Design a binder for this molecule. Structure first.
Ligand SMILES: *[B]([O])([O])[C][N]C(=O)/C(=N\OC([C])([C])C([O])=O)C1=[C]SC([N])=N1
Length: 360
Protein backbone atom coordinates (compact mmCIF):
# COMPACT_ATOMS: atom_id res chain seq x y z
CA UNK A 1 0.00 0.00 0.00
CA UNK A 2 2.61 2.70 0.99
CA UNK A 3 4.66 2.44 -2.26
CA UNK A 4 1.30 2.47 -4.17
CA UNK A 5 0.16 5.61 -2.23
CA UNK A 6 3.49 7.49 -2.86
CA UNK A 7 3.43 6.62 -6.60
CA UNK A 8 -0.25 7.76 -6.80
CA UNK A 9 0.66 11.12 -5.06
CA UNK A 10 3.66 11.84 -7.32
CA UNK A 11 1.84 10.70 -10.53
CA UNK A 12 -1.18 12.93 -9.62
CA UNK A 13 1.19 15.93 -9.11
CA UNK A 14 3.44 15.34 -12.21
CA UNK A 15 1.31 13.85 -15.03
CA UNK A 16 -1.17 16.77 -15.50
CA UNK A 17 1.65 19.37 -15.39
CA UNK A 18 3.74 17.39 -17.97
CA UNK A 19 0.66 17.23 -20.27
CA UNK A 20 -0.30 20.95 -19.77
CA UNK A 21 3.27 22.22 -20.41
CA UNK A 22 4.19 19.57 -23.11
CA UNK A 23 7.21 18.46 -20.99
CA UNK A 24 8.95 15.60 -22.84
CA UNK A 25 10.87 14.23 -19.82
CA UNK A 26 10.85 14.80 -16.05
CA UNK A 27 12.74 13.19 -13.13
CA UNK A 28 11.52 13.39 -9.50
CA UNK A 29 13.71 12.46 -6.51
CA UNK A 30 12.32 12.59 -2.95
CA UNK A 31 14.18 12.23 0.35
CA UNK A 32 11.65 11.06 3.01
CA UNK A 33 12.90 10.20 6.58
CA UNK A 34 16.40 9.41 5.18
CA UNK A 35 15.04 7.18 2.34
CA UNK A 36 15.34 8.08 -1.38
CA UNK A 37 12.41 7.58 -3.80
CA UNK A 38 12.70 8.09 -7.57
CA UNK A 39 9.96 8.67 -10.18
CA UNK A 40 10.98 9.05 -13.84
CA UNK A 41 8.63 10.15 -16.65
CA UNK A 42 8.81 10.43 -20.45
CA UNK A 43 11.76 10.96 -22.75
CA UNK A 44 15.24 12.45 -22.33
CA UNK A 45 15.34 12.65 -26.18
CA UNK A 46 12.19 12.51 -28.35
CA UNK A 47 14.26 11.89 -31.51
CA UNK A 48 16.00 8.68 -30.27
CA UNK A 49 13.37 7.52 -27.68
CA UNK A 50 15.87 7.55 -24.73
CA UNK A 51 13.76 7.42 -21.53
CA UNK A 52 14.40 9.57 -18.44
CA UNK A 53 15.94 7.72 -15.46
CA UNK A 54 17.33 8.95 -12.11
CA UNK A 55 20.78 9.00 -13.85
CA UNK A 56 19.64 11.25 -16.77
CA UNK A 57 21.67 14.51 -16.78
CA UNK A 58 19.64 17.75 -16.93
CA UNK A 59 20.74 21.40 -17.03
CA UNK A 60 19.68 22.88 -13.67
CA UNK A 61 20.37 26.52 -14.62
CA UNK A 62 20.25 28.85 -11.55
CA UNK A 63 20.05 25.86 -9.11
CA UNK A 64 23.83 26.03 -9.91
CA UNK A 65 23.88 29.20 -7.69
CA UNK A 66 23.43 26.93 -4.58
CA UNK A 67 26.68 25.08 -5.63
CA UNK A 68 28.42 28.47 -6.14
CA UNK A 69 27.21 29.54 -2.65
CA UNK A 70 28.62 26.23 -1.26
CA UNK A 71 32.07 26.99 -2.75
CA UNK A 72 31.90 30.51 -1.20
CA UNK A 73 30.88 28.79 2.08
CA UNK A 74 34.11 26.73 1.79
CA UNK A 75 36.20 29.95 1.25
CA UNK A 76 34.45 31.48 4.33
CA UNK A 77 35.21 28.29 6.39
CA UNK A 78 38.92 28.50 5.29
CA UNK A 79 39.01 32.25 6.34
CA UNK A 80 40.05 33.18 2.73
CA UNK A 81 37.21 35.74 2.49
CA UNK A 82 34.51 37.43 4.62
CA UNK A 83 31.04 38.44 3.32
CA UNK A 84 31.80 42.07 4.47
CA UNK A 85 34.93 42.17 2.20
CA UNK A 86 34.86 44.80 -0.57
CA UNK A 87 34.61 42.96 -3.92
CA UNK A 88 37.76 44.71 -5.21
CA UNK A 89 39.82 43.09 -2.34
CA UNK A 90 39.83 39.80 -4.36
CA UNK A 91 40.50 41.17 -7.90
CA UNK A 92 43.04 44.02 -8.37
CA UNK A 93 41.54 44.77 -11.86
CA UNK A 94 38.49 46.11 -9.87
CA UNK A 95 40.58 48.47 -7.62
CA UNK A 96 39.41 52.06 -8.31
CA UNK A 97 36.00 50.88 -9.64
CA UNK A 98 32.61 51.10 -7.85
CA UNK A 99 33.43 47.54 -6.59
CA UNK A 100 35.64 49.30 -3.99
CA UNK A 101 32.25 50.15 -2.31
CA UNK A 102 30.32 46.87 -2.88
CA UNK A 103 30.51 43.86 -0.47
CA UNK A 104 30.67 40.14 -1.36
CA UNK A 105 27.31 39.88 0.53
CA UNK A 106 25.75 42.52 -1.84
CA UNK A 107 26.94 40.46 -4.87
CA UNK A 108 25.74 37.10 -3.41
CA UNK A 109 22.26 38.50 -2.52
CA UNK A 110 21.66 40.65 -5.66
CA UNK A 111 21.82 44.00 -3.75
CA UNK A 112 24.96 45.54 -5.38
CA UNK A 113 22.75 48.39 -6.80
CA UNK A 114 21.11 47.19 -10.05
CA UNK A 115 23.47 44.72 -11.76
CA UNK A 116 21.13 43.41 -14.49
CA UNK A 117 19.56 39.94 -14.89
CA UNK A 118 22.02 39.08 -17.72
CA UNK A 119 25.38 40.31 -18.91
CA UNK A 120 24.58 42.52 -21.92
CA UNK A 121 24.94 40.84 -25.35
CA UNK A 122 28.10 43.03 -25.89
CA UNK A 123 29.87 40.85 -23.21
CA UNK A 124 31.03 37.46 -24.62
CA UNK A 125 32.66 34.60 -22.61
CA UNK A 126 36.02 36.44 -22.63
CA UNK A 127 38.11 37.37 -19.52
CA UNK A 128 38.97 40.90 -20.84
CA UNK A 129 35.31 41.74 -21.77
CA UNK A 130 34.07 40.57 -18.29
CA UNK A 131 36.86 42.54 -16.51
CA UNK A 132 36.07 45.72 -18.57
CA UNK A 133 32.28 45.28 -17.96
CA UNK A 134 32.68 45.33 -14.12
CA UNK A 135 35.34 48.12 -14.23
CA UNK A 136 32.88 50.53 -16.01
CA UNK A 137 29.63 49.51 -14.20
CA UNK A 138 27.97 52.12 -11.93
CA UNK A 139 25.10 51.43 -9.46
CA UNK A 140 21.58 52.76 -10.19
CA UNK A 141 20.90 52.89 -6.39
CA UNK A 142 22.82 52.44 -3.10
CA UNK A 143 24.39 48.99 -2.66
CA UNK A 144 22.46 47.04 0.03
CA UNK A 145 19.07 48.75 -0.62
CA UNK A 146 17.32 46.91 -3.53
CA UNK A 147 17.23 43.29 -4.70
CA UNK A 148 17.43 42.79 -8.48
CA UNK A 149 17.96 39.09 -9.36
CA UNK A 150 21.20 39.04 -11.37
CA UNK A 151 23.55 36.52 -13.04
CA UNK A 152 26.49 39.02 -13.23
CA UNK A 153 25.96 39.74 -9.47
CA UNK A 154 26.24 36.20 -8.01
CA UNK A 155 28.53 35.26 -10.99
CA UNK A 156 31.09 37.79 -9.71
CA UNK A 157 30.54 36.50 -6.11
CA UNK A 158 31.55 32.96 -7.26
CA UNK A 159 34.43 34.26 -9.39
CA UNK A 160 35.83 36.24 -6.39
CA UNK A 161 35.28 33.29 -3.99
CA UNK A 162 37.45 31.21 -6.40
CA UNK A 163 40.10 34.01 -6.52
CA UNK A 164 40.14 34.03 -2.63
CA UNK A 165 41.05 30.27 -2.87
CA UNK A 166 43.78 30.99 -5.51
CA UNK A 167 42.30 28.57 -8.15
CA UNK A 168 39.88 28.78 -11.11
CA UNK A 169 36.18 28.38 -10.22
CA UNK A 170 35.66 25.40 -12.57
CA UNK A 171 38.69 23.50 -11.16
CA UNK A 172 37.60 24.10 -7.53
CA UNK A 173 34.04 22.86 -8.32
CA UNK A 174 35.25 19.75 -10.21
CA UNK A 175 38.21 18.73 -8.04
CA UNK A 176 37.12 19.83 -4.48
CA UNK A 177 33.37 20.68 -4.18
CA UNK A 178 31.75 17.77 -6.14
CA UNK A 179 34.06 15.12 -4.56
CA UNK A 180 33.58 16.56 -1.01
CA UNK A 181 29.74 16.25 -1.54
CA UNK A 182 30.02 12.67 -3.00
CA UNK A 183 28.75 13.76 -6.47
CA UNK A 184 30.14 11.66 -9.40
CA UNK A 185 27.20 12.44 -11.80
CA UNK A 186 27.48 16.25 -11.42
CA UNK A 187 29.40 18.23 -14.09
CA UNK A 188 30.28 21.68 -15.33
CA UNK A 189 31.74 20.07 -18.51
CA UNK A 190 30.02 16.73 -19.23
CA UNK A 191 32.62 14.08 -20.14
CA UNK A 192 32.31 12.38 -23.55
CA UNK A 193 31.72 9.10 -21.61
CA UNK A 194 28.60 10.63 -19.89
CA UNK A 195 27.13 12.44 -22.99
CA UNK A 196 24.68 9.54 -23.65
CA UNK A 197 22.99 10.47 -20.27
CA UNK A 198 22.66 14.22 -21.26
CA UNK A 199 18.95 14.88 -22.00
CA UNK A 200 17.95 17.04 -24.97
CA UNK A 201 16.39 20.41 -24.05
CA UNK A 202 13.23 21.56 -25.89
CA UNK A 203 12.05 25.11 -26.72
CA UNK A 204 9.71 26.60 -29.40
CA UNK A 205 8.78 24.08 -32.20
CA UNK A 206 10.85 21.61 -30.06
CA UNK A 207 14.06 23.38 -31.22
CA UNK A 208 16.93 21.50 -29.48
CA UNK A 209 18.66 23.59 -26.78
CA UNK A 210 21.75 22.57 -24.78
CA UNK A 211 23.44 25.60 -23.18
CA UNK A 212 26.45 27.16 -25.00
CA UNK A 213 29.29 29.32 -23.61
CA UNK A 214 28.50 32.60 -21.79
CA UNK A 215 30.31 34.99 -19.41
CA UNK A 216 30.68 33.43 -15.90
CA UNK A 217 28.36 30.60 -17.11
CA UNK A 218 29.89 28.05 -14.64
CA UNK A 219 29.14 30.31 -11.60
CA UNK A 220 25.60 31.32 -12.73
CA UNK A 221 24.10 28.24 -14.40
CA UNK A 222 26.93 25.77 -15.26
CA UNK A 223 25.80 22.54 -13.55
CA UNK A 224 24.45 19.42 -15.32
CA UNK A 225 23.35 16.70 -12.90
CA UNK A 226 21.03 13.73 -12.39
CA UNK A 227 17.96 13.66 -10.12
CA UNK A 228 19.80 11.09 -7.93
CA UNK A 229 22.93 13.31 -7.62
CA UNK A 230 20.93 16.50 -6.95
CA UNK A 231 19.04 14.60 -4.19
CA UNK A 232 22.46 13.66 -2.70
CA UNK A 233 23.15 17.45 -2.63
CA UNK A 234 19.73 18.06 -0.96
CA UNK A 235 20.55 15.29 1.58
CA UNK A 236 23.91 17.04 2.32
CA UNK A 237 21.92 20.27 2.88
CA UNK A 238 19.48 18.42 5.25
CA UNK A 239 22.43 16.91 7.26
CA UNK A 240 25.59 19.09 6.94
CA UNK A 241 26.84 17.45 10.20
CA UNK A 242 27.51 14.16 8.22
CA UNK A 243 30.26 15.85 6.11
CA UNK A 244 33.88 16.58 7.10
CA UNK A 245 33.77 19.79 9.19
CA UNK A 246 34.91 22.48 6.65
CA UNK A 247 32.20 21.20 4.22
CA UNK A 248 29.57 21.04 7.01
CA UNK A 249 30.39 24.76 7.68
CA UNK A 250 30.28 25.51 3.89
CA UNK A 251 26.70 24.12 3.65
CA UNK A 252 25.66 25.90 6.90
CA UNK A 253 26.78 29.24 5.33
CA UNK A 254 24.05 28.70 2.65
CA UNK A 255 21.37 28.42 5.45
CA UNK A 256 21.66 32.06 6.70
CA UNK A 257 18.99 34.67 5.78
CA UNK A 258 20.04 38.34 5.37
CA UNK A 259 16.82 40.18 4.40
CA UNK A 260 13.16 39.65 3.45
CA UNK A 261 11.24 40.57 0.28
CA UNK A 262 7.56 39.76 0.72
CA UNK A 263 7.32 36.21 2.13
CA UNK A 264 10.87 35.27 0.99
CA UNK A 265 14.08 35.38 3.13
CA UNK A 266 17.23 35.56 0.93
CA UNK A 267 20.23 33.35 1.78
CA UNK A 268 23.34 32.52 -0.23
CA UNK A 269 21.78 30.75 -3.25
CA UNK A 270 18.78 29.38 -1.25
CA UNK A 271 15.56 31.41 -0.82
CA UNK A 272 13.42 30.49 2.20
CA UNK A 273 9.73 30.64 3.27
CA UNK A 274 7.88 29.85 6.50
CA UNK A 275 6.38 26.33 6.24
CA UNK A 276 3.51 25.77 6.06
CA UNK A 277 2.61 28.60 3.62
CA UNK A 278 -0.14 28.75 0.96
CA UNK A 279 0.61 27.50 -2.58
CA UNK A 280 -0.33 30.98 -3.94
CA UNK A 281 2.30 32.68 -1.65
CA UNK A 282 5.05 30.19 -2.65
CA UNK A 283 4.13 30.78 -6.34
CA UNK A 284 4.25 34.60 -5.76
CA UNK A 285 7.75 34.34 -4.16
CA UNK A 286 8.93 32.53 -7.34
CA UNK A 287 6.98 34.85 -9.72
CA UNK A 288 8.29 36.76 -12.79
CA UNK A 289 7.97 40.18 -11.02
CA UNK A 290 10.04 38.85 -8.04
CA UNK A 291 12.80 37.88 -10.53
CA UNK A 292 12.68 40.82 -13.01
CA UNK A 293 11.86 43.97 -10.95
CA UNK A 294 13.86 45.63 -8.16
CA UNK A 295 12.39 45.25 -4.63
CA UNK A 296 13.36 47.29 -1.51
CA UNK A 297 14.69 44.80 1.09
CA UNK A 298 13.81 44.54 4.79
CA UNK A 299 17.30 43.88 6.27
CA UNK A 300 17.40 41.54 9.32
CA UNK A 301 19.20 42.99 12.37
CA UNK A 302 21.34 39.78 12.38
CA UNK A 303 21.52 36.82 9.96
CA UNK A 304 18.68 34.31 10.56
CA UNK A 305 19.13 30.52 10.68
CA UNK A 306 17.17 28.99 7.72
CA UNK A 307 16.09 25.84 9.59
CA UNK A 308 13.10 24.32 11.39
CA UNK A 309 9.62 25.27 10.07
CA UNK A 310 10.89 26.62 6.72
CA UNK A 311 11.04 25.60 3.08
CA UNK A 312 14.32 26.37 1.27
CA UNK A 313 14.02 26.40 -2.53
CA UNK A 314 15.62 27.40 -5.80
CA UNK A 315 14.28 27.51 -9.37
CA UNK A 316 16.66 27.14 -12.29
CA UNK A 317 16.13 27.61 -16.02
CA UNK A 318 18.07 27.49 -19.29
CA UNK A 319 16.61 27.88 -22.80
CA UNK A 320 15.73 24.11 -22.88
CA UNK A 321 15.39 23.07 -19.18
CA UNK A 322 13.42 23.84 -15.99
CA UNK A 323 14.58 22.66 -12.56
CA UNK A 324 13.22 23.12 -9.03
CA UNK A 325 14.64 22.00 -5.66
CA UNK A 326 12.94 22.39 -2.26
CA UNK A 327 13.64 20.98 1.21
CA UNK A 328 12.20 21.34 4.74
CA UNK A 329 15.04 21.15 7.31
CA UNK A 330 12.69 20.56 10.30
CA UNK A 331 10.97 17.54 8.59
CA UNK A 332 14.04 15.87 6.87
CA UNK A 333 12.10 16.20 3.54
CA UNK A 334 13.81 16.92 0.20
CA UNK A 335 12.53 17.18 -3.37
CA UNK A 336 14.15 17.57 -6.82
CA UNK A 337 12.13 18.10 -10.03
CA UNK A 338 14.20 18.19 -13.27
CA UNK A 339 12.62 18.67 -16.73
CA UNK A 340 13.84 19.16 -20.30
CA UNK A 341 11.50 22.06 -21.05
CA UNK A 342 11.70 25.55 -19.51
CA UNK A 343 8.11 25.55 -18.14
CA UNK A 344 6.65 28.20 -15.83
CA UNK A 345 7.93 28.45 -12.25
CA UNK A 346 4.27 28.49 -11.03
CA UNK A 347 3.85 24.96 -12.51
CA UNK A 348 7.12 23.63 -10.91
CA UNK A 349 5.86 24.95 -7.53
CA UNK A 350 2.41 23.34 -8.15
CA UNK A 351 4.08 19.89 -8.54
CA UNK A 352 6.37 20.43 -5.51
CA UNK A 353 3.55 21.73 -3.24
CA UNK A 354 1.26 18.74 -4.04
CA UNK A 355 4.11 16.28 -3.20
CA UNK A 356 5.38 18.07 -0.02
CA UNK A 357 1.75 18.54 1.27
CA UNK A 358 1.03 14.80 0.58
CA UNK A 359 4.24 13.58 2.36
CA UNK A 360 2.93 15.59 5.43
B1 LIG B 1 18.45 31.14 -13.27
O1 LIG B 1 18.17 30.01 -13.97
O2 LIG B 1 17.38 31.69 -12.62
C1 LIG B 1 18.93 32.17 -14.30
N1 LIG B 1 18.01 32.49 -15.34
C2 LIG B 1 18.34 33.09 -16.56
O3 LIG B 1 19.45 33.34 -16.91
C3 LIG B 1 17.07 33.15 -17.42
N2 LIG B 1 15.95 33.65 -17.11
O4 LIG B 1 15.71 34.31 -15.87
C4 LIG B 1 14.35 34.28 -15.37
C5 LIG B 1 13.35 34.83 -16.43
C6 LIG B 1 14.31 35.18 -14.10
C7 LIG B 1 13.91 32.85 -14.94
O5 LIG B 1 12.71 32.65 -14.52
O6 LIG B 1 14.73 31.89 -15.00
C8 LIG B 1 17.26 32.44 -18.73
C9 LIG B 1 18.51 32.01 -19.23
S1 LIG B 1 18.11 31.32 -20.73
C10 LIG B 1 16.42 31.57 -20.60
N3 LIG B 1 15.43 31.21 -21.57
N4 LIG B 1 16.16 32.19 -19.45
Amino acid sequence: APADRLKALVDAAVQPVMKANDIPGLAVAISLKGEPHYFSYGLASKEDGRRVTPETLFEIGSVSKTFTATLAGYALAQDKMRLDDRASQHWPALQGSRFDGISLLDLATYTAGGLPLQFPDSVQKDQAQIRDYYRQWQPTYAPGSQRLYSNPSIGLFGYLAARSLGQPFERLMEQQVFPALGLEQTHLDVPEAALAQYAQGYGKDDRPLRVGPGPLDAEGHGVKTSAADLLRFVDANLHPERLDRPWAQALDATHRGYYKVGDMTQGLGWEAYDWPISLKRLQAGNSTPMALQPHRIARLPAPQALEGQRLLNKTGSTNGFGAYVAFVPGRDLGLVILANRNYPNAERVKIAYAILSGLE
